[PDB]
Every structure is written in structure tokens, then in C-alpha cells.
């Protein structure tokens, strides 16, 4: 296969076998340690972080009886998320998003999940996610996660991811609010570049979230026999959530469009202003310079000596020329 992961910092393998009586915890790095839990009939959860270690992830993927196509989809990072259906297993890819201040661009990390028989696999490209709340919920016997099957864990991970999307949406909402307020107060270049990057980020967020609602609708309507019917409505709930998310993105995009177009078509008007500022001063002052070069003549004879009060005359001439040249304008708003 091929490797295209951006990060090579760290690798980690974690296992989680839950039951109505006891849960199993095991922190390690050896790939072999997870072989026995695969044979267990109880539902299991596997976490692998770090796509740089291609050998171990390939061995795991081909050890569970998964088609190479799913494996190369896992290795592939630059593609739109979309769910894969099969007669035995299902495979799902998502682009979990995170945002930060001091620099306005979306941060996408690919997260892959596989549900086969009674086993859930999940692969993260980079260290750092928001999948813990369900972890400490199941760890402390909270909720009813233990009683239900692996589909509960699958859509719990999905709903946690869309909750992270909710958080990122509220951060972006703050972004539009502050950008619009600053633009209304003072439209300047920096806010305009912020508008550019916000528009690009909104387009990317749209491109990532639009497939999500279709994916959730597919998992709702298709209902493959692998997933138990008892969890059928719950997925729909997540779908509803995604719908909300999709909606807000659209609105936000509309807003930034309104924050862009009015700034564009008026730029030519700006040029006119510059025109006028470069013209009137060139209209009034340039002849004066010429005048300053004439009555400051340096011939052998000075005709100005014959003239009486010559400088009051020349200063008055320059002043009245300036006045007539400045009242030549502004008659139809050049200032």
C-alpha cells in the first residue's frame, strides 16, 4: 500500500472489553497483544493512534478479515467522508474538526471506524480527541452502555463527534459575530482577509458536513442486519443533530457572503477618490511651481525691477489662480 499521513509523532494501541460485570483495561504498544480479544465473542473496542506505523495497522486490518479496499481507504486521508456497507461489516470515515484562536483555519483529523460482527475498530491520525466522556461514562457504570451491544458504542462515538462539531460551530459563531461587529465599526484590510479565510473555512466545513447527513440517513433507512433494530431510532437522533448542524453552516456562509460582496464592487469608487486627490493638488499646485520658476527668473536684466509692488501682484496672481482652480472643482462633488 501507500502512506500519506501528515504526522509521525507517536503511536499507541488500546483495548477495551466491557461487560455487565467487569471491564478490562490494558495499556501497551505491542501489536500482538490484541490478538486474543479478537476471538472473544463479547463486544470489544480497539483504539489505534498513529498512521505512520503502517506495518502494524496493515497486519491488524488484514487479520480481522477486512478487504484491502477498506485498508487503503483508512490510509487515504484526502477524501470526503462516506460510509461503506457490506454483507458482514460496515466501515465509516469521518473528518473530526478542531479550531483555535490566533490563526483562523480549520484543523481536520481523519478518524476511521469499523464495525464487524462484535468488534469496533477506530483509528486516529493525531493524538488528541474528545472521545473520553463516553469512556468515563462506561468506566464508572454510568448510563446503560454496558447492557447494550457495540452499536451503542458506535453511535455514542458518532454523537460525541457531532457534539464536538457543535462546539466548533459555536466558536465559529463567535468568529462571525466579532468579524461583523469589527467590519461595521471599521472596514479595513485585516478584517477583509479575515473574511477571506472565514469564507474558505466555511466552504470546507460545508464540504465535510453535507455528506454527514446523507451518511446518517443511509444508516437510518438501510438498517443492515449487522446493527440491531433496538438501536435504530437512536441513529436517527444523531441524523437530526447533523441536520441542525448543516442548517447553521448554510446560514453562516450566507452571512459571510453579505460581508464580502458589498466590499468588492465598491473598490472602483475608491479609485475615483484617489483620482481626485491626485488631481486637484496637481491642478492647483503644479502651475504655481511653474510660476515659481518664471518670476524667479535669472536673466541679465530684471523686468520685475520696473514693476512696482511686484511680489504683492505675483502672490495675488498665484492665490487667485489657486482659488479659481479649486472652485473649478467641487461644483459636482469631487471632494
Amino acid at each position: 500500500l501507500v502512506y500519506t499521513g501528515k504526522y509521525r509523532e507517536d503511536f499507541e494501541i488500546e483495548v477495551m472489553n466491557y461487560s455487565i460485570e467487569e471491564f478490562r483495561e490494558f495499556k501497551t504498544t505491542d501489536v500482538e497483544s490484541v490478538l486474543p480479544f479478537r476471538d472473544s465473542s463479547t463486544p470489544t473496542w480497539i483504539n489505534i493512534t498513529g498512521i505512520h506505523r503502517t506495518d502494524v495497522v496493515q497486519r491488524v486490518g488484514e487479520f480481522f478479515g477486512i478487504h484491502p479496499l477498506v485498508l487503503e481507504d483508512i490510509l487515504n486521508v484526502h477524501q470526503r467522508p462516506k460510509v461503506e456497507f457490506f454483507e458482514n461489516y460496515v466501515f465509516i470515515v469521518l473528518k473530526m474538526f478542531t479550531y483555535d484562536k490566533n490563526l483562523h483555519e480549520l484543523e481536520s483529523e481523519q478518524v476511521s471506524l469499523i464495525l464487524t460482527k462484535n468488534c469496533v475498530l477506530m483509528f486516529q491520525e493525531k493524538i488528541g480527541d474528545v472521545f473520553d466522556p463516553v469512556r468515563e461514562r462506561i468506566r464508572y457504570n454510568r448510563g446503560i452502555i454496558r447492557k447494550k451491544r457495540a452499536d451503542y458504542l458506535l453511535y455514542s462515538l458518532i454523537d460525541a463527534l457531532v457534539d464536538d462539531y457543535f462546539v466548533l460551530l459555536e466558536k465559529i459563531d463567535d468568529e462571525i459575530d466579532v468579524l461583523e461587529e469589527e467590519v461595521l465599526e471599521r472596514p479595513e484590510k485585516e478584517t477583509v482577509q479575515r473574511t477571506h479565510q472565514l469564507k474558505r473555512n466555511l466552504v470546507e466545513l460545508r464540504k465535510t458536513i453535507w455528506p454527514l447527513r446523507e451518511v446518517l440517513s443511509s444508516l437510518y433507512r438501510d438498517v443492515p442486519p449487522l446493527i440491531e433494530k433496538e438501536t435504530v431510532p437512536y441513529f436517527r437522533d444523531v441524523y437530526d443533530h447533523t441536520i441542525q448542524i448543516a442548517d447553521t453552516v448554510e446560514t453562516f456562509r450566507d452571512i459571510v457572503s453579505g460581508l464580502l460582496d458589498v466590499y468588492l464592487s465598491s473598490v472602483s469608487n475608491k479609485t475615483n477618490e484617489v483620482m481626485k486627490v491626485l488631481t486637484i493638488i496637481a491642478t492647483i499646485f503644479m502651475p504655481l511651481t511653474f510660476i515659481a520658476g518664471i518670476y524667479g527668473m535669472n536673466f541679465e536684466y530684471m523686468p520685475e525691477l520696473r514693476w512696482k509692488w511686484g511680489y504683492p501682484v505675483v502672490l495675488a496672481v498665484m492665490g487667485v489662480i489657486a482659488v479659481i482652480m479649486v472652485v473649478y472643482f467641487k461644483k459636482k462633488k469631487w471632494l
Partner: antibody, heavy 122, light 107 residues
Framework: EVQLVESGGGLVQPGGSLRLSCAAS????????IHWVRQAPGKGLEWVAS????????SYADSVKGRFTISADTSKNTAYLQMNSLRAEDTAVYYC???????????????????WGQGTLV | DIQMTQSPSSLSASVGDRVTITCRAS??????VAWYQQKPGKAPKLLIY???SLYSGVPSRFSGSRSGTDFTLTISSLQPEDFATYYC?????????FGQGTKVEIK
């Protein structure tokens, strides 16, 4: 016509348990949300409890989570708020509030408390 | 767990003056905040929810605004019945937290 009533207050001996009763008139408890908010004498207000009977979901304040139990029913248009493990810092005024949801964006929905009550000492 | 700070602790002004009370949010809250007044020995009164939408029946001279993550409750002109305590609340989630409470004082 619409107004909100409170009851169940009074002097409390430390270490005891007491139940506050919230009556309603002009409106029903089921349709809207009912909150309980505590204000210390001269200090800031604190939302202590929430209830929404129609949906059935119930949420409690973090600083009180586990101490109190809140519920309501439309049989008598009543809201019950039982409290145990009381202490002297709870010496404040407790208020009933009628709250309705409102829409700001398609993803996050706000909340507001329009009608309150005179409250009782706790 | 989102808290909500308010400034100043208290303010003093006379009738016919514009006063601004600011509300800072340590964590992000989308737009869900509310502004309340509390006359002594009286139930709190809702004034402005969503930081830009006014309740029905409140004086028209009231207003509010939202800048970035921060919030502002401003009054163009005080009233003799308006000197009171003001309160800032956020309702981003089911866990809702109030503000410190600013006291309006006469000069």
C-alpha cells in the same frame, strides 16, 4: 391573570430536610419549564434547580447535584423540590421561575426567565 | 461549566445619564444571555434576552449589544425607578450560571 406561587419555606433546623412547593395559576406546569433560583442576602443569584415535566428530562445545578430532588406534576399544577443535607450557607431566598425556550441559531437554542415569584426563605 | 464575570462591581450616576455594564464570558457562549433588574424586596424582572432582543413591555430606552464573546447592557438615560441591581445570565446549555450583579447608585 397569569402568576406564579411559592410555598414550603420557613425556619429550618440544621441537618434537616424540607420540601418546597410551587403552585401555578393562569398557566400549566407541563407546557413550560420551571426553574428554582437562590439569592443570598446581598449576593449574586444562583440557579439551583430546573424541571421540565412534559418531556420528563430533569437537570440539577452542579454545586447542588445530588443534594436536592426536583419534580413536578400537572395533576395539581404543582412542583416539588425536596432538599436534604442542608447547611447555613443555604440561608437565602428561593424563587420559582417560569422559563420558555427561544431560537437564536439552528444549532443552539437559548433560554430566558420571564416570570418569577416572591420566593421563600431557606 | 461556563462561568460569567460582570463589570464593574457597582456604578454610580444621576438621572439622565448613559451607563454601560459589561459581561465577560470566560468560555464561549453562542448568543444566549439575559439581563435582569432587581428592585429591593421584589422579584427579578426580565429585560433583554439574546443580548439584542428586548422583552415585551419594558421601556423602549433599554438596549443591549454583543461584541465578540463579551456582552454590554447600556442605558441611554437613567430613571429614578431605574437605580437598581443588574444581573447577567448565560444559558448555553442545561447548566446555567449567573453574574456577580452590579449595583446602580445615585450620584
Amino acid at each position: 391573570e397569569v402568576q406564579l406561587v411559592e410555598s414550603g419555606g420557613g425556619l429550618v433546623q440544621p441537618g434537616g430536610s424540607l420540601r418546597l412547593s410551587c403552585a401555578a395559576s393562569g398557566f400549566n406546569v407541563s407546557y413550560y419549564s420551571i426553574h428554582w433560583v437562590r439569592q443570598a442576602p446581598g449576593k449574586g443569584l444562583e440557579w439551583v434547580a430546573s424541571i421540565s415535566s412534559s418531556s420528563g428530562s430533569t437537570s440539577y445545578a452542579d454545586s447542588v447535584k445530588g443534594r436536592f430532588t426536583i419534580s413536578a406534576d400537572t395533576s395539581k399544577n404543582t412542583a416539588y423540590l425536596q432538599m436534604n443535607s442542608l447547611r447555613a450557607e443555604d440561608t437565602a431566598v428561593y424563587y420559582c421561575a417560569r422559563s420558555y425556550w427561544y431560537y437564536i441559531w439552528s444549532y443552539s437554542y437559548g433560554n430566558a426567565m420571564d416570570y418569577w415569584g416572591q420566593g421563600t426563605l431557606v | 461549566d461556563i462561568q460569567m464575570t460582570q463589570s464593574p462591581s457597582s456604578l454610580s450616576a444621576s438621572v439622565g445619564d448613559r451607563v454601560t455594564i459589561t459581561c465577560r464570558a470566560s468560555q464561549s457562549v453562542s448568543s444566549a444571555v439575559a439581563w435582569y433588574q432587581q428592585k429591593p424586596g421584589k422579584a427579578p424582572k426580565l429585560l433583554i434576552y439574546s443580548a439584542s432582543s428586548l422583552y415585551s413591555g419594558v421601556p423602549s430606552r433599554f438596549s443591549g449589544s454583543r461584541s465578540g464573546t463579551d456582552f454590554t447592557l447600556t442605558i441611554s438615560s437613567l430613571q429614578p425607578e431605574d437605580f437598581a441591581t443588574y444581573y447577567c445570565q448565560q444559558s448555553s446549555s442545561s447548566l446555567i450560571t449567573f453574574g456577580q450583579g452590579t449595583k446602580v447608585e445615585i450620584k
